[PDB]
Amino acid sequence: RECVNCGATSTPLWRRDGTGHYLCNACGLYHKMNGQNRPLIKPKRRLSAARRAGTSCANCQTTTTTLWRRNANGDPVCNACGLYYKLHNINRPLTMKKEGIQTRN
DNA sequence: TTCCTAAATCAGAGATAACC
């Protein structure tokens, strides 16, 4: 078990939010008292596995992504290319390909 | 000093489940 807000793996008392997640005591109390997520000393780590053996994006050729998706032909595509196609019904152009992947909140 | 926020601890409501 780990806290959804801060990633802590131990706490004096586990609490939960209204949607199936666990919160450490500190984070749970903060949210209830203020209505906002408990601010972190340092950002909560995440990122995870960005590569997969034997896989690259059929549309932009990248080998790293936050989530491997599939195109209509059944080939793996990276998260950016799969989402761009869903929104625009055209493939994401190579001109949009960037050097790295950003992280958020 | 007193005020206030943060977060551990305490009380007990409701969930789980041992055992008859």
Place this chain on the structure above:
DNA sequence: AAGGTTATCTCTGATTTAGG
């Protein structure tokens, strides 16, 4: 096998404790 009692667990909310 199923159902009732109620020990015990696991939370939510109240209170206490500690610092700034």
